[PDB]
Amino acid sequence: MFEIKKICCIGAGYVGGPTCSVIAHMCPEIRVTVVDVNESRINAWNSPTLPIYEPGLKEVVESCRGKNLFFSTNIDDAIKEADLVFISVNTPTKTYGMGKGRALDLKYIEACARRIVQNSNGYKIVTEKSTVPVRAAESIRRIFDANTKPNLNLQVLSNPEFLAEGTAIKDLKNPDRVLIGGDETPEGQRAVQALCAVYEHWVPREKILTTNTWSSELSKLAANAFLAQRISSINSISALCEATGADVEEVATAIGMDQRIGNKFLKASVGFGGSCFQKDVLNLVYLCEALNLPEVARYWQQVIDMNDYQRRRFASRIIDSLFNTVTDKKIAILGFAFKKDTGDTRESSSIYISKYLMDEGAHLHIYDPKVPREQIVVDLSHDQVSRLVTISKDPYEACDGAHAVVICTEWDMFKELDYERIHKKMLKPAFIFDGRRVLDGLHNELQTIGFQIETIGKKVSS
Amino acid sequence: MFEIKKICCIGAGYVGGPTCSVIAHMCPEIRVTVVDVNESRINAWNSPTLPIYEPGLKEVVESCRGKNLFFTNIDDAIKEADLVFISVNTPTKTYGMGKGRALDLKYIEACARRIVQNSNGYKIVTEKSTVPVRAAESIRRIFDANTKPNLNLQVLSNPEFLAEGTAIKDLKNPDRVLIGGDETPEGQRAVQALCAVYEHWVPREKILTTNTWSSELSKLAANAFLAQRISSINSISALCEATGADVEEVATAIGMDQRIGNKFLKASVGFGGSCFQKDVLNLVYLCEALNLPEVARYWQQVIDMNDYQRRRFASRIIDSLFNTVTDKKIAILGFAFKKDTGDTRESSSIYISKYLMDEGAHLHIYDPKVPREQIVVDLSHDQVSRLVTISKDPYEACDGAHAVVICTEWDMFKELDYERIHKKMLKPAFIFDGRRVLDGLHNELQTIGFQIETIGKKV
C-alpha cells in the first residue's frame, strides 16, 4: 500500500491554506508545501500577519512554518517532489457566454491539469480540493490521458472542503465528516486509501466516507443547496407569518425541536448571503438544465427565487411605510456584511436592499463596524453612489435626521444601542425595520419611546 | 358651529390659484392668502401679467387683490388660517417602484410636515390637488406622529374638476362640489365648515359630502369613465372601417339614449392631455397594489385601446405610401392634444410623428398656436435635426409632400385651399383625416385627385 510523504497544494486561499496547515500540524512526518500563483499571498503567509483571519490559525502556522510547512512561488518544484497534489484554485461563476451567471469557469483548473501533467513523472495523486462542477474530474482525467508520458500514472480523486468562515480550525481538527471520492477500480482504491490514511492521523475511521468521484463532486454542491433550502423555507414561512399573525421565531423553534429536522439553519433573515450558497445552487440548476432535467432545475431554482423575493419584499415594506416616496429622504443602513462578525460583503443582502432604496432616490447613510469604507462604494457601483450614498463612522451619525433605521446584519452591537437618543433626532414618524430579528424582546420598549418597529416574520400591530 | 375666517392655500399653480380667487370673490368676509415657495410666481400674480391665461381671471383677481386676496410668507399664513389648502402638483413617478404609473407624494410630504410645524390649536387641512387614494391617511399619519398639546388638525378631501379653458366658469357654476371627511363628530364639523364656504355661491344640492376615501377615488374614476367613452367609441371606429359602417352615425345613435348621453363620443386618433392617461394609469397601479388584478387589466384596456388607435392610424399612412417613407415629405397639420390650445402634453401628434420618424420620413409640422421650441423638445429623447422641419404655414409644409396628415381638429384646416396644395404635392397625394373634420368634403377632395381616408370610414 502506497504511503504519502510529500504534499503539494496549488492555491493558498481559505481552502488549501487552513487545510494544509492542519495537515502539517497533525502529520509531522509529512512535508506540506502550499503554493500559489499570487506572490503577495505567499509573502503574507510568511509574514507575522496572515492574509485570512481564522481563530487559532496563528498558533497552527507558526508551529509548523519551517519544519514541515512551507510556502513558496516555485510551483514546478513542489509538484515534482510531492506524492499528493491538491488543486485548491478558485472556480468563479462564468460572467459570459453559455451559462453566464450560473455555470462555473474551469480555466483555473484546466491550467493546473496541464501544468501538473507537465512537471510530473511517475506515480502521483491529484486531488481536487475546491468546489468544482460535477464530471469535472473526468475533464482532468481526459487531459492526463491525452498528454500521457511513459511511466506516468496519475490518479484523480475528489476531496472537497466543508469549513465555514469563522470556525475553520475547529472544523478541520474535529470535522463532521471527511469526503473522499475516487474511481471504483483497484488503482483508484489504492489512491483513496492513501489519502484516507493521511486523515486517520487525527480523524476516526467512522467519520471518513469513501464514495465514487461523481458522488463526491455532487455532494459538495447539494450540501450547500440543502442548507440554503432550509433558510428559504423558513423565510417563506416568515412571509406567511406576517399575513396570519404567527411568529416565525416561534414556528422555527417548534419545527427545530423535531430531531429529524434539527434546529440549525432556521433563523429567518432578509436573505442568505456569502459566495457559496447562491453560487452552488445556481450551478446545480445549470447542471440539471444541461442534463435535460428541467423538473429538477426548477425545483432548486425556487431556493434562489425565494431568497430574491425575501429581499425585494423587505425593501417594499420600507418604501410602502415611507408613503411610497423616498426621494431625498435620509435612511440609516446599519450593517453591510452578509453576516455578523466579518467584513465580507459577497452577495450580501445589504447590497440589494441598498440598491432597491437607491432606485427610489434615497439618501442612504450606511454603517458597519468592520466592513471597510472602500468596499461599500465598490459593491454599490456598476456616479450614482456619490449622490445618494454616505458612509457614517458611527451609528448615531447615520441616524441624525433619518426617517427610518434598517438593520440588515445581525451585529450584536445594534441590540445595545441607545434608542432613546436616536428617536430624539429622527423625523417623525420614526421607523425601525429589523431584518434579522435582533430586537426580539424590545418591541414594547421601542414602541413606548415612539418607534414603529417592523420585523421579518411578525404581523404589524396598531 | 365652527366658522372659517382665514384661508391659506399652499401652491399657486392653475389649481389653487383660480380656485382661491373665486372664493375671495364670493366670500368678501373671508381672508384668502395664496402662498408658494417660488417667488417668481407670486410676483406674477401681483403684476398686471398673470402667469396663467384663463378667461375672466383678471376680473376676479383685480376685484379682490388687496382686500381679502393676498399672495411668500408660508409660515405666518399657516399659523393664522383656519383652513389650509394643499394645491401642490403630484407628478407621475419616473423611477423606482411604480415608474410611469404611481404618483410621487414628495411635494405633499413637505406641505404636511410644514403645516404641522407652524400650527397650533384647531385647523382644517384640505387637499385640493389630484392625489392618489389613501393619501390623506399619510397626512394624518404625519399629524398624529408630530402631535402637540392642544392640537386638533382635521383632514379633508376637496378635489378640483376644472378644465384648461373654462376654469372660472366651472368654479362659478360647478356641476358638483366634492368634499370628503372622516365619519366622526369632529370630522363632520370640519366638513360643514368647508361646505359653508361654497354655500356663498353654490347651491347646497350640488355639494356632496362623502368620506375621505370616496372623495379621492371619485376624482380618479371620473377621468377614467370619460376616457373609457373615447376608447369605446374608438374601438367602434376600427370596427366601422372593417364593416363599412360610419362611427359618427353610430355615435349619434348611441348618444340619443338618455341613459348613455351624447357627450364624449367624438372618435379621434387618440385622447391627450395630462389628466386622462395619468389618472387611468395611476388607477391601474392602485389596483395592482391592492391585489385586484381583474380591475387593473379592466382599466388598462382604456390605455391599450388608445395606444392601438394611434399606432393603427400611423400604420395606415405607411401602408398607403407603399410601406416606405424614407426621405418622403409628410405634412403634419396640428400638434396640440386638442383644438384651441397650445398644450401638447400627451398629444397624439407626438406619437404619430415618432412612428413616422422611425421610418426615416421628412416631417413638416405646422400648428397655429404651438410654439416652435415646444415641438423640438417633445420629439427628442441626433434624430430631430435630420428629419423634423417646422413650417410657419400649411402650404409650406405641403410643398412637395406625399401626404397630408390632420391630427388636431383646428377649424382652419377645414377651410384650406386644397386645389393649390395638390398641384405642388407629389403623386399620388394622400389625405389622412385623424379627427373627422372633413365630414362633407369627401366628394370634393376626390375629384381634385386626393385619396382621402379618415377614422371610422371604410376606404
Place this chain on the structure above:
Amino acid sequence: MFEIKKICCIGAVGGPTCSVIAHMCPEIRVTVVDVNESRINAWNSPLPIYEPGLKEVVESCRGKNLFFSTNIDDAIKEADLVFISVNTPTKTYGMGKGRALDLKYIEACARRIVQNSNGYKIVTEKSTVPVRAAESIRRIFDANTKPNLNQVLSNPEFLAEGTAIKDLKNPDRVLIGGDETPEGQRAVQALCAVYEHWVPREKILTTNTWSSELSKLAANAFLAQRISSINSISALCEATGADVEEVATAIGMDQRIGNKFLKASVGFGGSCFQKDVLNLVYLCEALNLPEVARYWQQVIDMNDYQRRRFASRIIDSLFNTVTDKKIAILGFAFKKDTGDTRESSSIYISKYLMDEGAHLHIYDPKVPREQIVVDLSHDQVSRLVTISKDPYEACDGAHAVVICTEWDMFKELDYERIHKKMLKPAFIFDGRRVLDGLHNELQTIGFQIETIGKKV
C-alpha cells in the same frame, strides 16, 4: 406586335444578364446604366465582378451593342425595354425591421422612369421584390400619367453567384408575369421574343404578375426548407446513431424528392435564402395568415438551431471553457469557391466562440483579410480575433480545428503535422461533411473527430 431593339438596365444581377442578351442578340442595343460612377467605369475597363466566362462575353460586344454608361436619363428615353435591377435591401428600421423589404430604390426608379419617358415602353422588374410591388408601380404610373403615355411586367432572376453565365445561356426556366389584359399579353410576348433568340419556348413560363413575384420568393424558401429539413435530420442522426449522409442518399434516390440540396451543414448562408424566407413570413403576418407565417419561420429557426447547436458542441467538448484558448476556424465564406461572406455560418460560429473569450485564428483562401474584421464588429475584435495567412499557422498551439466552409483544400491538409503542434486533446469539428472517409485515419493519428449528423 412590338419588337424590342434597345435595352436599358438600371443597376450594374443586371450586368451579366444583359451581357448575355447582347451576346445572343447582336441586333439589339444593350445599355447598362447605374447611378454609381465607380461601377460603370469598372465595366469599361479590362470587370468589377468575377464570373467564369464573363470577360469573353463582355469583350465580344462591348462597343458593338453592349454599352455601360452613367447617363440614365438618355438610356431610358431611347430604350424599348427598361429593366429594374436595383437592389431591395431588408429594412433595418421602422415597421418590418429585419424582415420587410425597402422599396425606396424601386420608388425612385418608378418616378424617374415615368419622368424621362414618353409613348409605349415596357417596364420589367428584374430584382427580388415583395409581392404586390408591381401594383405599387402601376399606381405611380397612373398618378403621374401624361397624354399618350402607356406596361409593368415581372421577370425575376434565378442565377447563382458562381455559374451566372452558364445559367443564363442555358436556363432551367424563364419566368415572366403580366396582367391578364390584352395589353399585358402583348408585353409578355414582346419580352418572350427576346429570350427566344437562344432559349426554347418550352422553358418559358407565362403567369400573372403576382404569381411571378411570389414564385421567386417561394422558390428560395423551398430550397432553404430542404437544407433545414436535412439539418433537422442531422440532429436526429447524432442522437440515434444514424448517419445523415446515408439518410440523405436514401431519401435522394426517390425520384419525387430528388437528391439536390440535401447536404447537411452547419447552416445555409448567402444574401438570398434567409432574406426571402423572412420576407415571406412578414408578408403572411401582414395578411393575417399566422399559421402560414410560423410554418415558414421554422426554416429560419431550424437554421439558427443548427448553428447554435454546432457551436455548443465545440464548447462542451472543450470542457465548457474556451477562455484564452486557441481555436482554428477554417473557412469563412458561406460556401466554397467564393469570397462572399454575407450571412455566412462561419460568422455566427465565430461570434458564439468569441462570446466565450476564445482566441480565434481564422483562415480562408479567398475571403479578404479586411472583410473578416468587419463582419465580426458591431475593440472586442482586436483582443480575440487573429487572421492567419495560411493554415497550420492557425493550428499552432490550438485546442481544436473547426471547418465551417466546404473548401476542397481542407480535405487535402497534412493532419499528421497539425497534431504534433496542437495541444492535447486535439479536436476536429467537421461542419460540412468534407472529411467523410478519413475518420479512421484521423483517429489513429490521435484526433477526436466529430461531425454533423454522426454520433460520436
